[PDB]
């Protein structure tokens, strides 16, 4: 699943036994209940531009 369109994950993807897939996030983010989206948990998460984010 992960090899195809990142398994639908916004960030990291792990393949499991069968058609099972777990999305994951970089530190400073949490996975949403959709199981694909990553939301920041810190004021300055990596790879985001504050002046553009706050705009």
């Amino acid at each position: 699943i992960c090899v195809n369109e990142n398994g639908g994950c916004e960030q990291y993807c792990s393949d499991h036994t069968g058609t099972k897939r777990s999305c994951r996030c970089h530190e400073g983010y949490s996975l949403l209940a959709d199981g694909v989206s990553c939301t920041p948990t810190v004021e300055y998460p990596c790879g985001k531009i504050p002046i553009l984010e706050k705009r």
């Binding site: 090899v3 300055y44 504050p50």
Partner: protein, 254 residues
Amino acid sequence: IVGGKVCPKGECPWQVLLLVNGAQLCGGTLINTIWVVSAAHCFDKIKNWRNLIAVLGEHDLSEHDGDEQSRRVAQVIIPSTYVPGTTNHDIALLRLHQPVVLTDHVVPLCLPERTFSERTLAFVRFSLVSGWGQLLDRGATALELMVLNVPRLMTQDCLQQSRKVGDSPNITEYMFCAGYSDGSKDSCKGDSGGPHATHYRGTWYLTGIVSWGQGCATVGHFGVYTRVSQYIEWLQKLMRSEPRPGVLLRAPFP
């Protein structure tokens, strides 16, 4: 950077400026509050290891605006496979003596997982390359941080689209080509060590390091970047390790 534009202040917040005795040395990429990724070749001619400074939140070299944060570089980690004066394995991992403070102007770039970088990021066509390097080949360096959007090429396509120059170094699996062959846009030697940053679903990641090329924006040639995906596990293991006395450290690769 040749043929780019000024990166608006705060829009390249992971950009690092490396200084030796206050003189511009190289670029770098902040990946968390204490670690910087740069190019190993930046350090081939260093003698005064204690005079090496990393500057975060830098934008304009002619003025101090208060957003700049300077830190001494406590450690420079180079893979054992890197040979000074050669092109392969061009990566260095730097530990800052004290963490930088994250602010609107100082933010780390995400170091991606290897699988995500190889299967997804490697297929994003365009990425940004940045630095205070030469504005032209054999020209002056920039006072304001510059940024350029470059397309990535498969190595087979890079070699077929390139002008066959004698004694040219091989493009290994630890490198990738990005840029243009028309001589209008490229990163330059003074941008060495700087980020090649890739956007994916609202987040930016580290995919490359400004490494080498034939001149700067030379017709028939592309920029060559260190393929960061090959070093993820090597970087992660070192970031979890205790500091060791002495600035330079050669660490086994793989």
